[PDB]
Symmetry: C5
Subunit: 107 residues, 5 copies
């Protein structure tokens, strides 16, 4: 198993690491039919999504998707700083595949 998000991102095609190093700017959540997703943006202008489980996501990914959206919501509310983001750049906006958060210093 990978010991790093960037190492994990290396195992997939069409993925890419985006060093965020910033808190989430906006949390968007939709329960609208066929567009049940989450969209997060940062002050950098960068926009990402947790695409709709719509006709092709493994069973192993089902819960992992819900977990990711959970994480994004709480990360937003707590204003926690996101380090990096492993995303699929072949989608618009870029779909989130993994997330990392580092709590540097103050240890």
């Amino acid at each position: 198993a990978p010991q790093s998000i960037t190492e994990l991102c290396s195992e997939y095609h069409n993925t890419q690491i985006y060093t965020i190093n910033d808190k989430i700017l906006s949390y968007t959540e939709s329960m609208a039919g066929k567009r049940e997703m989450v969209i997060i943006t940062f002050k950098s202008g960068a926009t990402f999504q947790v695409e709709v489980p719509g006709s092709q996501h493994i069973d192993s990914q089902k819960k992992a998707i819900e977990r990711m959206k959970d994480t994004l919501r709480i990360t937003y509310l707590t204003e926690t700083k996101i380090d990096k983001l492993c995303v699929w750049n072949n989608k618009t906006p870029n779909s989130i595949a993994a997330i990392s958060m580092e709590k540097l210093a103050g240890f």
Copy 2:
């Protein structure tokens, strides 16, 4: 996929964007038979709901409904400021379809 709530709201009929820019005033939750919904209001007078799951909804929408109600509760408790709300205005009160929050407050 849409890159904004405003853009996503544009993809549906009977929907409308309401710039809230305020924290939730009141959280109402019911588990009463046939009406296990949530009703949120703001100091503006505006009232919204996360309607009861029925035939008008699809399967993917089942969890998304639960998530929305979850979000509304925590958003209330943490007194977080809601930016906009994509809602279906052909329902009373207006049913929530999407929600956005901005932390311009950084």
Copy 3:
């Protein structure tokens, strides 16, 4: 759909609104066989419960029950002030049907 808890409470028999306007005093939770419930009390002496899921509830009320218990726990821990409670008074203690909260401060 009702736009108020008061209005929602009006749609059922044996229900009643109790203006609590206070934070929860005690949170009691049981996982004991056949007594899987939650009991909340206030300084007023008032005691309420989220009765055990039985035949009295309907198919699509099962999650609403869990949600209510979730709400009660967090409401307790965060010391949030509960406004009103729509409860069935034909039970002992009074079973909770709906709950409202309103943060009237800034």
Copy 4:
């Protein structure tokens, strides 16, 4: 339905009320095969568990078990003070059946 944890504890054999009146000292959680449980201890030396789901439980308790463990974790993290604990003393360590917390006790 019981209006008190002490009252509820009275409805079972092998149970007993233990006045804790203290915050949790240590939270232990295991996902190890056949040891999916939680163990909490207090500075008084007392140790308790939320035993692994098996036949002693009925389907109703299934979620109530997860809820209890949820409660124990958050109670720990938030350093919330636990009042009493209704536990089955015929188990080692004592299995938790119910829990009570009482705010503004001074």
Copy 5:
């Protein structure tokens, strides 16, 4: 049932107790296909994971896995101090089997 994480770790082959006594340094979470896991590291250099659900896990462990991951996320966010970790050292990185957190500090 074990009354200690150290005691519980003694019941398995290939496990080992690692006295962490520190808050989590980094939380990594992946929903990527076949790599749906969590990776946590500390300033000591130590790296751990909550491996992807497969054959090595029994139907029992399924939820306990999700619980562990839940715990790790909140533990990180709240900057809570982890005391010990019972892990399987026959995996890379070391897979988490149990976790303990002590108070009187944190």
